[PDB]
Amino acid sequence: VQQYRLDELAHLVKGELIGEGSLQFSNLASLENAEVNHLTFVNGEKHLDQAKVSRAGAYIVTAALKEHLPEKDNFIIVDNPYLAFAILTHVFDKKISSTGIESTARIHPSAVISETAYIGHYVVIGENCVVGDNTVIQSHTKLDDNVEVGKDCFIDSYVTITGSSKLRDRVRIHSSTVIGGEGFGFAPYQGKWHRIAQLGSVLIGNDVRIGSNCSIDRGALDNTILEDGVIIDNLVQIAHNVHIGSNTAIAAKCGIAGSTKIGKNCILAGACGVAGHLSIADNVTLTGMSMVTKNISEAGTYSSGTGLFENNHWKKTIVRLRQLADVPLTQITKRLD
Amino acid sequence: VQQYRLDELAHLVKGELIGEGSLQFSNLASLENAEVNHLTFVNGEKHLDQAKVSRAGAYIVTAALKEHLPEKDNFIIVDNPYLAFAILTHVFDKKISSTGIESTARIHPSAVISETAYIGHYVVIGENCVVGDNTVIQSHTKLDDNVEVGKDCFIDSYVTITGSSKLRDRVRIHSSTVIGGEGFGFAPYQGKWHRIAQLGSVLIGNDVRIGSNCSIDRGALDNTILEDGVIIDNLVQIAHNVHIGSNTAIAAKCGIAGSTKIGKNCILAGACGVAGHLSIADNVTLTGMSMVTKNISEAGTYSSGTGLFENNHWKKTIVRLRQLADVPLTQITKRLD
Amino acid sequence: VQQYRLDELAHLVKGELIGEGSLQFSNLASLENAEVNHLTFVNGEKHLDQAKVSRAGAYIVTAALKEHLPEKDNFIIVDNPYLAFAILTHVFDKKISSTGIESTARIHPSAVISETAYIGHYVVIGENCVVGDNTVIQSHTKLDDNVEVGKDCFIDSYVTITGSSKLRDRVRIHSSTVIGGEGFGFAPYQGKWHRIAQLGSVLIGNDVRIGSNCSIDRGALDNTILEDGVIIDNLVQIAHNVHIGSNTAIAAKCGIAGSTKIGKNCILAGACGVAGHLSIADNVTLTGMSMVTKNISEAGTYSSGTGLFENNHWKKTIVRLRQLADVPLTQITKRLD
């Protein structure tokens, strides 16, 4: 494909070069599958063994790791090889330098589209819409009236941006997601449900990522807010009026119900469920499949689940669980006449 | 921005007016963010403090509440404020009565399309399809052969309606949703899976709402049926042959497995799992992340799950959970001699 | 509509014909809803009483069942009726015969499209793409650059295939699915998330089926692999680098996190969550909603969850549960001296 010298690659991550700076490199690769023209990284000493044996031509390493790799000659020394790696993934990433407006697209005459944005085939952009510089909007995607997309944004295919959602800069949203959809609002009467119109929108901050097949609903009256730097994997449900604080990560298949606020720097593992009208403090980490039903006021790590059981062990465990309510537990832990 | 007089708004909800019936209002708003030109609603006495402090022009309240609101002058007195509010959200909802067939739609000559319907751009409609009066079918959506949509329906973009699904009146289905999809039929032989074709369909009642990123699979032989007034949030799995009773509500991320039947007036909270070939009786609420593996014969509220735990308390809780099988429980409660 | 003779059908399943060979049949159907021109099947004695009352014209039964069915004259005998039924579903399943490329498609000239393939309306096919013989790409779907799709594949609408994904033969992918989208790769620095570009791809073997609304992310450096035979239901998350063994079945709504390997012939029930960097061995069955956090290294059936509880009972249970950690359980069953 296309080649990079080691010296350039070390300079790019602002690291100390060791070994022949003029060596060619085609790609990044894992320890196991790397070859000579491949640059790789050693993430802590758990991976020393795979490193020692790797056929990779150079190594992104910590200084205390370089000492444990005499077998090897060419290095890039940095304090955080993982972040240096992360930077360089983009150098090797094959880039979409595409620009201009595909003639099958339907852009309402009132919309402002930067001359360096890309609008895909069969994209539809409505009244008062704005798409910023170097923004990429892929094919079939639709932008409803009054939707604004900032700079350096990536929006893939079959994404719906509606409810006049407003997106800042460096926002990326993957295929088949819905931003700004009509949330689940229903009033009961005569044992039937009256639909509640949904009159709010969505604010989406800078540097925010959203996976595929996600549903981010627009607020019922105010806004659903995804603060700066929030990251969200595939198949997440974010209900109306959810407010997600800065740099919070939400793993695949989490569900955050209506009007809940999640603090800054929170980490939710796969398939957590958070009920409605709750606050979750800053710096809360929830492990896989946590069911949150009350508030969380203290920072920390929280969990729910029974863990894994062999099936028979399980069957008997849950029979004994069913019996616990009839057992006075603490009133025997200290019962001795 | 179109205005409405306070006396009309009170008439529109069958409500008693108090205050200057000629006052102008742009929109509904929340207690916290309402301005002078905004109508709002106080839902029970838990919100009085937010209400008193609010800058809302007028108030939707009950008689028992207007009393505890001396601070305010113009009200609309109704018996269920939530429902009066629900009605008025539509009056402020950005109403779209577009009509006709966009010129980039691909429609089979054999399909019957009501003159009052709207077929959007890039819409594809197959043989013997019927789209009834006043139905909106948004851009990019597809209707396979023998699919029928009734009157006054809203079908959004990137919706697949297949397997000759039959949708009645006032049915609304949101984006990235698959109605009628081939269900999960696989017979085992020689340690491989023989795919079973699926020859059924889907009956979707009047007044049924389906969210985004949902999958409603057709029957293996008969029909998957969603009865009148069923409402379904985003990210729901309805498997082949599931039958859902009238006005049952199904929250986000629920999965209902093949051939199961859920009664009338049921409520399923977020992320429930209902296993195959079961009956759930009329009038059953399940709470969040509930796991149902047997029939539910009696009405009532049901639950599964541990609570949330701080992580160390979780780890030690589950260590002790694992020991529970080997521990005589009912043979020590009656053991006092 | 379209008619078949009983003897043809008997022959199609390598089956002993009993009764009038020349009888006409339109369709399969259930024991409950079959009419004279419907063929049906009796699956063991459990369904015998239903069969006795069926208006079905003919019955796919096994010898020791014909036995208990004197009420009925027309049969097809076979050793496994379910598999016989499955073979015949395809005979009645409406054939999708179409060939060619619709004019509303956009296909880059450097793409190779078989003359026996169908490219549906509005499809977008990128550079260096390959589409095999008899493959169907339904309307609206997109293939990005370097995507390859084998022979006899079916790929429904609003599918995104990207990340240079490679698909073998007889792969079928349902609607709203995203194959090979950027995985959840993020580095932490200064309490921010730096995005990690995702450089691998996806290999999908022969005879793989994927449901609707699924996300199958590309690998970080190496590939995400679905081996031959793998079947995956609707709404599943398969993270970057997940490796899934031949003939494994993944039920609706499962999540497998990054870098997890899953052996051959596994069965995961609906809504399981498997954590990252784990091994599950060949022949493992998980029951609905299991949470795997450690490697499972022996074949067997595994589970997690509490039972379903009536709600009051549930609340007392979790209170007792919470008390469990403070109670020594093994030190009291062995307390008698």
Short mmCIF file of N, CA, C and O in Angstrom, two decimals, chain C residues 60-99:
data_model
loop_
_atom_site.label_atom_id
_atom_site.label_comp_id
_atom_site.label_asym_id
_atom_site.label_seq_id
_atom_site.Cartn_x
_atom_site.Cartn_y
_atom_site.Cartn_z
N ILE C 60 -48.11 -35.54 7.90
CA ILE C 60 -46.74 -36.01 7.89
C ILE C 60 -46.54 -36.63 9.25
O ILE C 60 -46.46 -35.91 10.26
N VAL C 61 -46.50 -37.95 9.30
CA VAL C 61 -46.42 -38.69 10.57
C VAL C 61 -45.36 -39.76 10.50
O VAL C 61 -44.98 -40.18 9.42
N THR C 62 -44.92 -40.21 11.66
CA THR C 62 -44.03 -41.37 11.75
C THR C 62 -44.85 -42.66 11.97
O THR C 62 -45.95 -42.60 12.52
N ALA C 63 -44.33 -43.81 11.54
CA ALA C 63 -45.03 -45.11 11.67
C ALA C 63 -45.82 -45.28 12.97
O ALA C 63 -47.03 -45.51 12.94
N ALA C 64 -45.13 -45.15 14.11
CA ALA C 64 -45.78 -45.36 15.40
C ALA C 64 -46.73 -44.22 15.77
O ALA C 64 -47.12 -44.08 16.93
N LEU C 65 -47.07 -43.40 14.78
CA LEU C 65 -48.06 -42.36 14.95
C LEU C 65 -49.24 -42.63 14.02
O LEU C 65 -50.39 -42.61 14.48
N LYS C 66 -48.98 -42.91 12.74
CA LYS C 66 -50.05 -43.36 11.84
C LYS C 66 -50.93 -44.33 12.60
O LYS C 66 -52.16 -44.31 12.49
N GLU C 67 -50.24 -45.16 13.38
CA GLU C 67 -50.81 -46.17 14.26
C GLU C 67 -52.00 -45.59 15.03
O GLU C 67 -53.11 -46.11 14.93
N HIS C 68 -51.76 -44.49 15.74
CA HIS C 68 -52.79 -43.89 16.59
C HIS C 68 -53.66 -42.87 15.87
O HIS C 68 -54.25 -41.99 16.51
N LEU C 69 -53.79 -43.00 14.55
CA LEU C 69 -54.50 -42.02 13.73
C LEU C 69 -55.51 -42.64 12.73
O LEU C 69 -55.58 -42.22 11.56
N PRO C 70 -56.32 -43.62 13.18
CA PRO C 70 -57.25 -44.29 12.27
C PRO C 70 -58.30 -43.34 11.66
O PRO C 70 -58.80 -43.58 10.55
N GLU C 71 -58.62 -42.27 12.39
CA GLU C 71 -59.52 -41.21 11.94
C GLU C 71 -59.12 -40.62 10.59
O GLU C 71 -59.93 -39.99 9.91
N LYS C 72 -57.86 -40.84 10.20
CA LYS C 72 -57.26 -40.17 9.04
C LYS C 72 -56.72 -41.14 7.97
O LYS C 72 -56.17 -42.19 8.31
N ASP C 73 -56.87 -40.79 6.70
CA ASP C 73 -56.56 -41.74 5.62
C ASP C 73 -55.27 -41.45 4.87
O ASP C 73 -54.56 -42.38 4.47
N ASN C 74 -54.96 -40.17 4.69
CA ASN C 74 -53.80 -39.74 3.91
C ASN C 74 -52.58 -39.39 4.76
O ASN C 74 -52.65 -38.54 5.62
N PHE C 75 -51.46 -40.06 4.49
CA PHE C 75 -50.23 -39.87 5.27
C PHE C 75 -48.97 -39.77 4.41
O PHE C 75 -48.96 -40.17 3.24
N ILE C 76 -47.91 -39.23 4.99
CA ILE C 76 -46.56 -39.41 4.49
C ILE C 76 -45.78 -39.94 5.68
O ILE C 76 -45.66 -39.24 6.69
N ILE C 77 -45.26 -41.17 5.60
CA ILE C 77 -44.42 -41.69 6.69
C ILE C 77 -42.95 -41.28 6.52
O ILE C 77 -42.41 -41.36 5.41
N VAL C 78 -42.33 -40.84 7.61
CA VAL C 78 -40.88 -40.56 7.66
C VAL C 78 -40.36 -40.81 9.06
O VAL C 78 -41.13 -40.90 10.02
N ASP C 79 -39.04 -40.87 9.18
CA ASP C 79 -38.40 -41.12 10.47
C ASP C 79 -38.37 -39.88 11.35
O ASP C 79 -38.53 -39.96 12.57
N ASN C 80 -38.18 -38.72 10.73
CA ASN C 80 -38.22 -37.45 11.45
C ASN C 80 -39.14 -36.45 10.73
O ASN C 80 -38.71 -35.79 9.79
N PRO C 81 -40.42 -36.37 11.16
CA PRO C 81 -41.40 -35.46 10.55
C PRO C 81 -41.06 -33.97 10.61
O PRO C 81 -41.43 -33.25 9.70
N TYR C 82 -40.38 -33.53 11.66
CA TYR C 82 -40.04 -32.11 11.81
C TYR C 82 -39.09 -31.69 10.68
O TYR C 82 -39.32 -30.68 10.01
N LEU C 83 -38.05 -32.49 10.45
CA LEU C 83 -37.12 -32.25 9.36
C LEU C 83 -37.79 -32.39 7.98
O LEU C 83 -37.50 -31.62 7.06
N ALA C 84 -38.71 -33.35 7.86
CA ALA C 84 -39.58 -33.50 6.67
C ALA C 84 -40.45 -32.27 6.45
O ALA C 84 -40.66 -31.83 5.30
N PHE C 85 -40.97 -31.72 7.54
CA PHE C 85 -41.79 -30.53 7.47
C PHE C 85 -40.93 -29.37 7.02
O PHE C 85 -41.35 -28.56 6.19
N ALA C 86 -39.71 -29.31 7.55
CA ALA C 86 -38.80 -28.25 7.22
C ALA C 86 -38.41 -28.29 5.74
O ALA C 86 -38.30 -27.23 5.10
N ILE C 87 -38.21 -29.48 5.19
CA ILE C 87 -37.83 -29.56 3.78
C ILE C 87 -38.94 -29.04 2.90
O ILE C 87 -38.68 -28.44 1.86
N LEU C 88 -40.19 -29.23 3.34
CA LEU C 88 -41.36 -28.85 2.53
C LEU C 88 -41.78 -27.38 2.66
O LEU C 88 -42.48 -26.85 1.78
N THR C 89 -41.35 -26.72 3.74
CA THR C 89 -41.60 -25.29 3.92
C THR C 89 -41.05 -24.53 2.73
O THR C 89 -41.70 -23.62 2.23
N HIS C 90 -39.87 -24.94 2.27
CA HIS C 90 -39.24 -24.30 1.11
C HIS C 90 -39.96 -24.53 -0.21
O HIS C 90 -39.90 -23.70 -1.09
N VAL C 91 -40.65 -25.65 -0.32
CA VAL C 91 -41.43 -25.92 -1.52
C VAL C 91 -42.58 -24.93 -1.63
O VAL C 91 -42.89 -24.47 -2.73
N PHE C 92 -43.18 -24.58 -0.49
CA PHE C 92 -44.28 -23.60 -0.48
C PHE C 92 -43.84 -22.14 -0.38
O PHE C 92 -44.53 -21.26 -0.90
N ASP C 93 -42.71 -21.89 0.28
CA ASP C 93 -42.11 -20.54 0.38
C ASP C 93 -42.03 -19.88 -1.01
O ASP C 93 -41.48 -20.47 -1.96
N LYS C 94 -42.61 -18.68 -1.12
CA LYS C 94 -42.71 -17.96 -2.40
C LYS C 94 -41.32 -17.61 -2.97
O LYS C 94 -40.53 -16.88 -2.34
N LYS C 95 -41.01 -18.17 -4.15
CA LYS C 95 -39.70 -17.99 -4.80
C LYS C 95 -39.46 -16.53 -5.20
O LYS C 95 -40.35 -15.89 -5.79
N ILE C 96 -38.27 -16.02 -4.84
CA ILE C 96 -37.75 -14.70 -5.29
C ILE C 96 -36.83 -14.89 -6.52
O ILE C 96 -35.59 -15.01 -6.39
N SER C 97 -37.44 -14.90 -7.71
CA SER C 97 -36.78 -15.34 -8.94
C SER C 97 -35.83 -14.32 -9.61
O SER C 97 -35.03 -14.70 -10.47
N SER C 98 -35.93 -13.05 -9.21
CA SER C 98 -35.41 -11.92 -9.99
C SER C 98 -33.90 -11.89 -10.28
O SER C 98 -33.08 -12.34 -9.47
N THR C 99 -33.55 -11.33 -11.44
CA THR C 99 -32.16 -11.19 -11.85
C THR C 99 -31.95 -9.78 -12.42
O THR C 99 -32.91 -9.15 -12.86
#
